[PDB]
C-alpha cells in the first residue's frame, strides 16, 4: 500500500514540465523514476518506491514512462540514457542519480537525503 498522492504517473510532457518545476523552482523533495513498458527489470523498482513512500511522506515520486507520447522528451531534459534511472531532488537541485537496478542503493539514498 501507499499514499495515493505520493506516487504520480505522468501522462504528458506538460505534466512532466510541471513536476520538474515543482522539483526545481518549488524546491520540493522529488524523485523521478524513468522506466519503460518494455523494460521488465524496471518493474522491480516500483514496489520498493511505494514501500518507502510511507517512510518519507514529504517526497513525491513521479513515474516517467519514456514509451509514452511526449514523455520521450523527458530523457533529454534530465540527461537520461538508460532505464531504470532514478533522479533525486532536494532543495531545488539534483542530489543523486541511480542508473540501473540497484534497490539497496535506492533505500540508502532515500534515507541519506530525506530522513
Numbering used by the authors: -1 to 113
Give passages from the manuscript.
TRXo1 and TRXo2 share high levels of sequence identity and similarity (74% and 97%, respectively) and their crystal structures are quite similar and overlay well (RMSD of 0.9 Å).
TRXo1 crystallized in the orthorhombic space group P212121 whereas TRXo2 crystallized in the hexagonal system and belonged to space group P65. Well-diffracting crystals of TRXo1 and TRXo2 were obtained with one molecule per asymmetric unit (a.s.u) with Matthews’s coefficient (Vm) values of 2.3 Å3 Da−l and 2.0 Å3 Da−l corresponding to solvent contents of 46% and 40%, respectively. Their structures were determined by molecular replacement at high resolution of 1.80 and 1.50 Å, respectively. The distances between Cys37 and Cys40 Sγ atoms are 2.03 and 2.05 Å in TRXo1 and TRXo2, respectively. They represent the typical length of disulfide bonds, suggesting that both TRXo isoforms were crystallized in an oxidized form. Close examination of the resultant Fo-Fc electron density maps revealed a negative density between Cys37 and Cys40 in TRXo2, and additional positive density in the opposite sides of Sγ atoms. Refinements, using PHENIX and Coot in an iterative manner, indicated that this effect is an artifact of data collection (radiation damage), due to partial reduction of the disulfide bond by the X-ray beam during data collection. In TRXo1 and TRXo2 X-ray structures, the distance between the sidechain hydroxyl of the Tyr31 and the Cys40 Sγ atom are 3.76 and 5.51 Å, respectively, too far away for an interaction. The NH1 guanidinium nitrogen of Arg41 is hydrogen-bonded to the carbonyl oxygen of Ser74 (2.85 Å) in TRXo1 and to the carbonyl oxygen of Ala12 (3.50 Å) in TRXo2. Even though TRXo1 was crystallized at pH 7.5 whereas TRXo2 was crystallized at pH 5.6, which may explain differences in the solvation shell, TRXo2 would be more positively charged than TRXo1 in a pH range between 5 and 10. With a pH value of 8.1 ± 0.2 for the mitochondrial matrix of A. thaliana, the global charge of TRXo1 and TRXo2 in vivo should be quite different with values of −1 and +2, respectively.
